[PDB]
Amino acid sequence: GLDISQATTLKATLEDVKIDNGTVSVDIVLTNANGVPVTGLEQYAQINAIGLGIAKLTPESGKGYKTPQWVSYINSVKAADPARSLANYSYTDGKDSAGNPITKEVKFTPGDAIQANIESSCKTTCLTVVDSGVYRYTFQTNLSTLPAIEGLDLTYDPTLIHRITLELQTDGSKDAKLVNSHIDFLPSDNFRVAKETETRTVVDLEANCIKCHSTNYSDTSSTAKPLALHGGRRIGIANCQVCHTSYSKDPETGSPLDMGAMVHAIHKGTYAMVGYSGTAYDFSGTMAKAAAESGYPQYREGKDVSERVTLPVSIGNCQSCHSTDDKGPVDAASFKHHKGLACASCHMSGFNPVDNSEWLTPPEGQKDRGFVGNYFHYYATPEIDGIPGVNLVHVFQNGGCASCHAEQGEEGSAKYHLAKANATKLLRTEYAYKLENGTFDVAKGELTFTVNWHSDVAPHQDPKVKEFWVSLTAFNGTEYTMGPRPSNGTLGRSENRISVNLAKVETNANLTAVPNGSKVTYTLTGIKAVIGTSSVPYKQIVSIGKGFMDGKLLICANSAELDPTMDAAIDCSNTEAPIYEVIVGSNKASFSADASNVTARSIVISEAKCANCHGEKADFSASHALTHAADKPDNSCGTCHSAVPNTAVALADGSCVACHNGAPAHSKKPFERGFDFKVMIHQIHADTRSVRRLTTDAATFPENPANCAACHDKGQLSLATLGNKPAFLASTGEYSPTVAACASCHATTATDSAVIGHFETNGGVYNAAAGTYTPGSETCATCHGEGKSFGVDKVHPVKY
Ligand code: HEC
Ligand code: HEC
Ligand code: HEC
Ligand code: HEC
Ligand code: HEC
Ligand code: HEC
Ligand code: HEC
Ligand code: HEC
Ligand code: HEC
Ligand code: HEC
Ligand code: HEC
Ligand SMILES: [Ca+2]
Ligand SMILES: [Mg+2]
Ligand SMILES: [Mg+2]
């Protein structure tokens, strides 16, 4: 074998568990990455951790099926530190309908609490060498003589599945010589390993979490953000599950440490607790707000962390974390079954049995179902629920018990939770359409194009179609440029873009529709511009004469239809149930003088990678809420500003760059919060944007922003033509294209004259007078293109 002092990697597996009159042992099989036994562990002076846990999987009972839950054998009752037991606080947030300020209250319930834990302090004292690289760990903890803990059943039951976990770390290693392992087994059958179907998994790191989270544990960069907890030693889900049990709490706050309640509340931005060394972790950001507004002496800037989690999907998007495609854990369907803490962790945010003690008592002559049960059955309202507008009691009264209480194989509350996502997919398939290329007779000012629609009931004839936008944008073959803001025109107020609502043909004097079965041919007139030095509507559409067309169809859907075998689409004018909008995009068609294709804009990011975090086909109309959001995209200021809807769909095909490019029109922002798409997106996700329009909170990006592969595919960053693009002209001056791309992280202002000088030495311009840069002048690609001497793929912590 190889001495641990010289082993550069560790791997470990657990086997041959033995439990005898309460005495537990397991073998740790330790090797390096090439499978050579690693010897010397039991004498090594550089061990950071050898922690072993053990838990039993215990059944749960109630109405319907309830999933089994882990009970650790190893626990203690933790006292609260008095100084760090968080006081309640309140803070202002917005105004009510009469214009008066709204105050919100945050409440805690500090007090003694149980916490599950593992055996960590024994380490080599509990080791015996059984073979080369095979170390038997015999627990100090005897299962027969565990201290009684009130309300916890710690009896050893060999007929239950058990789990033993290992955390092993040497040499301060974040990865190479860190391991989390476990083994799940059945003592009553000779301690054999458990089948996947016998044990409890629920979520899987790869299937359910890495879509957002970095797992680059070794990342040495300044912006590293791997999902590694408790100083870095804890990385494996199975290890979390032994301590993060249903009964474990933080005594400083009363907050649940249950894996599900904790993870839901973290990602909802409601969780707050005090952890190791008395550090407060407030995932809402509201503690810092109260401290600044009112004073809150327990919040210590620079030590405690109070930041609002910014989740890139809705907290209702269960499928971001819970597999429904049978490619995740075999018990993935566990999220369909009621469990008090799980259901509470979204619907009962901020409530507790002290401050809401009335809910401990059910209404006269109804059965007591406990605190959470009584809320769901009796006391919930839309006005107070953790999910605004949700009416759980209406479901109790009118929806039938199986709406929440599910036998194995049934959907339970997932009938409600997944209803809109499911109907959305079906409606996008039903209403799918294709845009054929446009013929633009520029002298006549007329564009003709045919939509291949899903049926012979045309868009304007279908009252389920709310609007059907097609937007045309001029593209000169090099890059989009929004250009200056013109005076208003009949069709819009942009030089390079027109958005037309095909659903309102009959009241639009500039639009005619001629059907031919399921094909509808539209003719849009009045696309005329006097071309000179002045800005006028459609100036670039006319001068260039070609570009692209993008569809954004809005369908009305019925929130009250929960039966997937029924039609979810509904007449937009219906007033009996709430309607939600389903968005259906399209191919990006060309328009040109003869309807020939216009060569596509290069693709330099990955659609699928944006969707890893934001989910499939994320909508960004709400991102356009700040300014002239209510103005329609065919009407004056709304041509650019609309949020009703924003008229782009796809993220990686230049649809957004139609506007977000180097030439924002007016009222311009400076570079450090620039409009150009690459600048803006880099800044948001790297937290280098000086000000975000709609929030004071920086994005909490769950990857490393310097991991370019989070958004870019290999080969997309040659930089070979980037210098040929026009400069980005911000408020104060312009920035050449590669300079803009890199400075958006590296130099948002001229704080470091060596960095700025480096740009300028190599053909770049930084905050220069408009017109300074000549396309072709940057020489960056020669050194920084992928694979080159200082290639972007070499100098950044990428994970392709
Ligand atoms: C016992 C050995 C644990 C293991 C294994 C894991 N966690 Fe843990 N965690 C544990 C306790 C007792 C506490 C509360 C400590 C207290 O002072 O009350 C926590 C806390 C967290 C938190 C909150 C923030 C923090 O305190 O650092 C998080 C986000 C957290 N734990 C996550 C977590 C994950 C995801 C784990 C597996 C990879 C995991 N922990 C393992 C105890 C233990
Ligand atoms: C990731 C950010 C999540 C989101 C989004 C949703 N859930 Fe979740 N859920 C998550 C974890 C890590 C866990 C804990 C698994 C464990 O080991 O305890 C859960 C658990 C639940 C449960 C309880 C399951 C059980 O204990 O058997 C339920 C009922 C549940 N989740 C439901 C649920 C719903 C309905 C969601 C969308 C509205 C949803 N979760 C989102 C992680 C995440
Ligand atoms: C956050 C991850 C949640 C968890 C955990 C649970 N629920 Fe939930 N619920 C959540 C949202 C975002 C929604 C709204 C869905 C929508 O399309 O708007 C709901 C809704 C419900 C409902 C329907 C209420 C109504 O239509 O008025 C029910 C009956 C419901 N949720 C029950 C429920 C149960 C029993 C849970 C534990 C299994 C549970 N929810 C967890 C968000 C989250
Ligand atoms: C979601 C809106 C619910 C509906 C509809 C019904 N119940 Fe329920 N119930 C719900 C929760 C979140 C809880 C608490 C579970 C916990 O772990 O704390 C309960 C509890 C019960 C119980 C107690 C046993 C249990 O399953 O935990 C019973 C016996 C019960 N509920 C019965 C019941 C009946 C008969 C229903 C239809 C009339 C009904 N529930 C609807 C959530 C919801
Ligand atoms: C996870 C590692 C991400 C990937 C990959 C991408 N995005 Fe993202 N995005 C992420 C977070 C955590 C946030 C903050 C969310 C919030 O509510 O504050 C964002 C934000 C955006 C935004 C801004 C939305 C707004 O401020 O109105 C945009 C426009 C956006 N993201 C776009 C986007 C694109 C185009 C991506 C692929 C190139 C992409 N994101 C990837 C997390 C992650
Ligand atoms: C022109 C018709 C636009 C298209 C197409 C897209 N955006 Fe946009 N966006 C536009 C304007 C005029 C504004 C200014 C603010 C306003 O409310 O009108 C914006 C702003 C944004 C922001 C603001 C983020 C910040 O400053 O912190 C975001 C996140 C944003 N836009 C994202 C975005 C995406 C992802 C687009 C394609 C799906 C997109 N926009 C298209 C004008 C236009
Ligand atoms: C596209 C050709 C536009 C039209 C038509 C209108 N505006 Fe605009 N506006 C546009 C952009 C690209 C920007 C952001 C510039 C940047 O560099 O980030 C803006 C900004 C504003 C603002 C400032 C607030 C903001 O969200 O940044 C205001 C108050 C504003 N625009 C007003 C406005 C009005 C009143 C318009 C119709 C008369 C109008 N804009 C049209 C692009 C375009
Ligand atoms: C994007 C939709 C996510 C998915 C899927 C998962 N998580 Fe997440 N998580 C996300 C964000 C935006 C944040 C805040 C920023 C950050 O990376 O910390 C988090 C945070 C957590 C945490 C707290 C980490 C800490 O403070 O050290 C935990 C413990 C966590 N996330 C766990 C986790 C699990 C187990 C997931 C799969 C079931 C998971 N997250 C999915 C975004 C997203
Ligand atoms: C998602 C959050 C991103 C991360 C992480 C990185 N970049 Fe990016 N980049 C992003 C977008 C949305 C765009 C514009 C897409 C478009 O259609 O125009 C860009 C663009 C670039 C460019 C310009 C490339 C070109 O047009 O030839 C460069 C040079 C660039 N990005 C560099 C880059 C590097 C080196 C990163 C790791 C440090 C990186 N990006 C991360 C979105 C995202
Ligand atoms: C934010 C998404 C970035 C973009 C866009 C670009 N870079 Fe970057 N870069 C970024 C970070 C956070 C770091 C530090 C990484 C670390 O190890 O701590 C870097 C690093 C570099 C380096 C290393 C050289 C040095 O700074 O010592 C180089 C040479 C580099 N970056 C170049 C570079 C180029 C040419 C870019 C545009 C094509 C570029 N970066 C964009 C973050 C981001
Ligand atoms: C070779 C002759 C290069 C040319 C052409 C360009 N750059 Fe460069 N860059 C080069 C080196 C050797 C370094 C330092 C690497 C190190 O580890 O010390 C850099 C650094 C950068 C950075 C990092 C800046 C920082 O924050 O420290 C950036 C963002 C960068 N270079 C960008 C850049 C631009 C935009 C270029 C065209 C104008 C360009 N470089 C050309 C080597 C070379
Ligand atoms: Ca604590
Ligand atoms: Mg007409
Ligand atoms: Mg707007």
UniProtKB/TrEMBL annotation:
Heme c 11 binds at H746, H758, C780, C783, H784, F790. Heme c 6 binds at C343, C346, H347, N391, H417, K420. Heme c 4 binds at C209, C212, H213, H267. Transmembrane segments: none annotated. Keywords: Calcium, Heme, Iron, Metal-binding, Signal. Heme c 9 binds at H624, T627, H641, C656, C659, H660, R689, R693. Heme c 10 binds at T627, C637, C640, H641, H666, K669, R693. Heme c 2 binds at T67, Q69, R200, Q241, H264, C318, C321, H322. Gene3D superfamilies: Cytochrome C3, Flavocytochrome C3, Chain A. This is UndA. It comes from Shewanella sp. HRCR_06. The lineage of its organism: Bacteria, Pseudomonadati, Pseudomonadota, Gammaproteobacteria, Alteromonadales.
